[PDB]
Amino acid sequence: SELLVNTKSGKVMGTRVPVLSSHISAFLGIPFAEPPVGNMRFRRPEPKKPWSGVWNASTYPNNCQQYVDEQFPGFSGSEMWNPNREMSEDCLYLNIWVPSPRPKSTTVMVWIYGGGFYSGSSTLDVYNGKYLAYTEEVVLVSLSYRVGAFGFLALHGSQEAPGNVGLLDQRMALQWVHDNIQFFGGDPKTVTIFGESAGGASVGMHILSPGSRDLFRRAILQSGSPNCPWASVSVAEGRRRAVELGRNLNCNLNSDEELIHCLREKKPQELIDVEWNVLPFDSIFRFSFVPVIDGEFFPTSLESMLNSGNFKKTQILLGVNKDEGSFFLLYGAPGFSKDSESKISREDFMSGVKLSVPHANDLGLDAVTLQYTDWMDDNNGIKNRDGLDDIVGDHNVICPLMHFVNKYTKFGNGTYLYFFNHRASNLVWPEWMGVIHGYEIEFVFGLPLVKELNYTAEEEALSRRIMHYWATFAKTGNPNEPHSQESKWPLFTTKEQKFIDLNTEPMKVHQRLRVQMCVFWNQFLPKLLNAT
Amino acid sequence: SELLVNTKSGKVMGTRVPVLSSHISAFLGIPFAEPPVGNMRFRRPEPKKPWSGVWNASTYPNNCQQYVDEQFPGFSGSEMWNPNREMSEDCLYLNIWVPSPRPKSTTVMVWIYGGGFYSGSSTLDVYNGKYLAYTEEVVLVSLSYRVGAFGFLALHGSQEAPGNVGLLDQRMALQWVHDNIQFFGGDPKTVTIFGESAGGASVGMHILSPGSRDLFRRAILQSGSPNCPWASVSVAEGRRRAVELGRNLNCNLNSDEELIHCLREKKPQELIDVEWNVLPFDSIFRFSFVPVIDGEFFPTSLESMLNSGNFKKTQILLGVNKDEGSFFLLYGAPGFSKDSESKISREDFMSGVKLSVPHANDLGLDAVTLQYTDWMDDNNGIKNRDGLDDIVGDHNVICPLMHFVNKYTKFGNGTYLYFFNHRASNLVWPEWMGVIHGYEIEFVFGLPLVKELNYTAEEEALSRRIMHYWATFAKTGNPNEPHSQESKWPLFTTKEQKFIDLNTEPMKVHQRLRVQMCVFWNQFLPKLLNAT
Ligand SMILES: *[C@@H]1O[C@H](CO[C@@H]2O[C@@H](C)[C@@H](O)[C@@H](O)[C@@H]2O)[C@@H](O)[C@H](O)[C@H]1NC(C)=O
Ligand SMILES: *[C@@H]1O[C@H](CO)[C@@H](O)[C@H](O)[C@H]1NC(C)=O
Ligand SMILES: *[C@@H]1O[C@H](CO)[C@@H](O)[C@H](O)[C@H]1NC(C)=O
Ligand SMILES: CN1C=CC=CC1=CNO
Ligand SMILES: CN1C=CC=CC1=CNO
Numbered sequence A, B: 001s002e003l004l005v006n007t008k009s010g011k012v013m014g015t016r017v018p019v020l021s022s023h024i025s026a027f028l029g030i031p032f033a034e035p036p037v038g039n040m041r042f043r044r045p046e047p048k049k050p051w052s053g054v055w056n057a058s059t060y061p062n063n064c065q066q067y068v069d070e071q072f073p074g075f076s077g078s079e080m081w082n083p084n085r086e087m088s089e090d091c092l093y094l095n096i097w098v099p100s101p102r103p104k105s106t107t108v109m110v111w112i113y114g115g116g117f118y119s120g121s122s123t124l125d126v127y128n129g130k131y132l133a134y135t136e137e138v139v140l141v142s143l144s145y146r147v148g149a150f151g152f153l154a155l156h157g158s159q160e161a162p163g164n165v166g167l168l169d170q171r172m173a174l175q176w177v178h179d180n181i182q183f184f185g186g187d188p189k190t191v192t193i194f195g196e197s198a199g200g201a202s203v204g205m206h207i208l209s210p211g212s213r214d215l216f217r218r219a220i221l222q223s224g225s226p227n228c229p230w231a232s233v234s235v236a237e238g239r240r241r242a243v244e245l246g247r248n249l250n251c252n253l254n255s256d257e258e259l260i261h262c263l264r265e266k267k268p269q270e271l272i273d274v275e276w277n278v279l280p281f282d283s284i285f286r287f288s289f290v291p292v293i294d295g296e297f298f299p300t301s302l303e304s305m306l307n308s309g310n311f312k313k314t315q316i317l318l319g320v321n322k323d324e325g326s327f328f329l330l331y332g333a334p335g336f337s338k339d340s341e342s343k344i345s346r347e348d349f350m351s352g353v354k355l356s357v358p359h360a361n362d363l364g365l366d367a368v369t370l371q372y373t374d375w376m377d378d379n380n381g382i383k384n385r386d387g388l389d390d391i392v393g394d395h396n397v398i399c400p401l402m403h404f405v406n407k408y409t410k411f412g413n414g415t416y417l418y419f420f421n422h423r424a425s426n427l428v429w430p431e432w433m434g435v436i437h438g439y440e441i442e443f444v445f446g447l448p449l450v451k452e453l454n455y456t457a458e459e460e461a462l463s464r465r466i467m468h469y470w471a472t473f474a475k476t477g478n479p480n481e482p483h484s485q486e487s488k489w490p491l492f493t494t495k496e497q498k499f500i501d502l503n504t505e506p507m508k509v510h511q512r513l514r515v516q517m518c519v520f521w522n523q524f525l526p527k528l529l530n531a532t
Helices: A130-136 A165-184 A198-208 A235-248 A256-265 A268-278 A302-308 A326-332 A346-356 A362-372 A381-409 A457-476 A515-531 B130-136 B165-184 B198-208 B235-248 B256-265 B268-278 B302-308 B326-332 B346-356 B362-372 B381-409 B457-476 B515-531
Strands: A004-007 A010-013 A015-019 A022-031 A054-056 A093-098 A106-112 A139-142 A186-196 A218-222 A315-321 A414-420 A498-502 A509-511 B004-007 B010-013 B015-019 B022-031 B054-056 B093-098 B106-112 B139-142 B186-196 B218-222 B315-321 B414-420 B498-502 B509-511
Touching: A004 A165, A010 A022, A015 A130, A022 A130, A093 A130, A093 A165, A106 A165, A106 A198, A106 A457, A130 A139, A130 A457, A139 A165, A165 A186, A165 A198, A186 A198, A186 A457, A198 A218, A198 A302, A218 A457, A235 A256, A235 A268, A302 A381, A315 A381, A315 A457, A326 A381, A346 A362, A346 A381, A362 A381, A362 A515, A362 B515, A381 A414, A381 A515, A515 B362, B004 B165, B010 B022, B015 B130, B022 B130, B093 B130, B093 B165, B106 B165, B106 B198, B106 B457, B130 B139, B130 B457, B139 B165, B165 B186, B165 B198, B186 B198, B186 B457, B198 B218, B198 B302, B218 B457, B235 B256, B235 B268, B302 B381, B315 B381, B315 B457, B326 B381, B346 B362, B346 B381, B362 B381, B362 B515, B381 B414, B381 B515
Parallel strands: A010 A054, A106 A139, A106 A186, A186 A218, A218 A315, A315 A414, A414 A498, B010 B054, B106 B139, B106 B186, B186 B218, B218 B315, B315 B414, B414 B498
Antiparallel strands: A004 A010, A015 A022, A022 A093, A093 A139, A498 A509, B004 B010, B015 B022, B022 B093, B093 B139, B498 B509
């Protein structure tokens, strides 16, 4: 039977799912690790013990325990990101969509979800792998991993909570794919890892980490980079936040062992309820429990690894959206609301800057404010709002990614850079938010091909082109069809620094993506902060 | 006789001069001080002892001893600024052009020449007062003052060389005008002082200095401001440069008295030959012997005076030229030449920045470079050259003047701001230099009305309009004719910050002259340099 697969861990039974007037096979909720529960909370994951009999892989698995966004109850804009399955610490599962008939040795794509390392689910409507699996004839895997304190509580030196365990979850699922995807018709030597935001930082982290490199062939990073200022902390900062979490829950703080024991007795929601209390600054776009620069998963600082070529050398495809910052300002910054135009006063602008660059002294804050203020028109509410949007997107997403592409490209085997700037016609978020963080994902997963979802014909065409870029890149290391008649997405090179826009217009090629602003964020401001 | 005037110092005899098919009276080379020679070198000036008989005031006087520009021998572009009379330390004279017939009580304008406080002459072709005196019916005075070490050698605490003596020369001539201009038909209660570059800084310095304020009614500042970074030094820096000048001439340095005695024995050219050796940095747009912030002529720092309203409150008219920096780059910066287009390499750009902001640490230098570099096109030779031109003009002229207008306007009685951006059609300097420092002067003095000088008809019209703005402002405190049909030059106000362009096109009104760049120079960079 097409729906039955014997793997090295045991037999699994899938389910036939309809897709665009046809069908494919789905194997949902396959375990890749032992449930990380009880005395295993905070521990490195352990491989799943093989099972006798047939694993029922017909239904989506539990999502990992996480903070749930209740800022706009009933609003689909925000609720589409929330867990749509019961939450459990027993959450280490993966999902596979397989073309029908079962292929023999086809290109594999493995999705790693974002969510700031504090949230995310493999089971979201917008991550449904069937359209891409069906349309491009790939085997589509989505994995899961522990988030929040569960995935990233870091007490370096301890072996009960060393940090990075959520990244090791991701690695274990990649190992499982390596070992077993052949039985689903996947080629384990042609696995592309891809992810958005924290999932894109994750992808870059597996490129960097010696223990992950051999498990995949190539990589796609959407709106996320391993060097993002929000994506990792030092071992000292991770420790401080773990102790502070303990302090919030009235834990004995005399030793790691006393602290960890206390944290292990708490119900999952008890950790989540105080998770946001441990941040060192009043800030936006900062999350509590994130990867830790530990000397193990990352052997040295991210910057020295990037500089020395200490990373996997392969092809990468990556890029950003036009308005990365708007989502985070809406949630944290004064003056921003969902149902107004959010014109921002000079005062709210000033306050926004401080929230956005929490680590800056006053000189640093002045430098940012000057760089992003039109002094001929400093009270223009639209300009101040859009300026903040750029500050947040440039600092947190675009300029770290640009630093990564420039460093990577000197040692890698081929870089393709995009700038996604089409706003979906059916977005329910306000217009001021523009082309929002995360709203290229639906195009990558081919949702615009579903007529009931009410996209335009031009948006279906853009989705088809994006899916085919991603899958062709996955197959060959080049998003372009050989000997094709369409416009060519050129290689990003050190010298010419080319990229393309992704939108509904005819492809345009540009150079030096946001270079003026990224020189400020990547060269000048760090030098300013170090000297003062 | 029209050409004979009894003054409080004695009788003077002038000369009838032709002007535009008519005639007026000129009284040239009237002494206002005792020759500052011998044991009086470096001393405050003394009033001229009255003379018996008739002073022959038919010919231009000697110019003060100064460095002579020999960078382009035979080239009129540079030679038109050099002394056109014999140089002497006996140089404290003034020149008066008087309408014919002699007026009874008319508006007076007193010109103070620029030249970096190290040079300048009252007798230049381009300072000939007859066109303005004749055309606008004003009494036009040009004074002189000691420059270089002669005017500005400063050993604070000593009474033999206290500093600022060149400013006191200017003050003595203003006192003489106060006391005596009535006899030439001038109204001593309606004297406008006006000057360019160091002469404009001078004008602002008399606005500030308690001992000068009562001697004039109102003021015009062209391309110069008292707070310019090149226009004054501290008492400690003035002392250091005086000692260093002594060191260059093998002087005994054991005391002020030993130093001054030695400097007094030297021939004038001996001081001039080593004058440029005393500058503390490799720099452009910095001059050796300049006004000193002494606690006497200036009772406190220029900035605290501006902040507290400690200055004469009256009407001012002032502004700048589009390309203030080009002249100084040509003379000092690598990569700039008179007979090429001077396209500037990235290297020469970097070097230019250091010359332009000599007082900056590396962070400061990075801040400037970032502010003025187009990072999408950083190797564009034209952009780098024009960028440097703006750096030099903004730092040294435009932004200090903008800081002055903003501070002054909060306490003053009416401000009119211009931006002169017409390049003379007959300029012999290369085109890359644009609308050069100093090339509005010829328009203010009405040279375009002289047909043999080969200006266009439109340039004669611009000259006439400028002369009439200046003279009407001098007469009434407003450059606009009451109940006139032409476009109105609006008041510069704290709130709206209006100015006009001066050129051959119909008047346009703008706001916030170079505000983006001036916020950088006036607010951010000083804060950066203080913190680092
Ligand atoms: C496989 O599971 C299918 C769907 O099952 C449902 O959800 C899971 C999580 C369980 O709670 C189960 O009791 C629910 O019915 C079933 O339709 C199907 O019978 C199962 N196939 C088997 C057991 O061979
Ligand atoms: C990638 O590697 C191959 C084989 O080593 C090489 O021939 C090719 O030029 C490389 N391509 C790029 C874009 O670096
Ligand atoms: C100047 O001073 C006069 C008299 O004190 C006053 O009436 C007038 O408003 C002032 N003008 C400006 C522009 O400040
Ligand atoms: C809320 N959320 C979670 C994961 C990825 C994106 C995201 C987005 N909003 O744009
Ligand atoms: C050389 N020189 C002297 C005084 C004023 C201006 C000047 C100018 N060049 O523009």
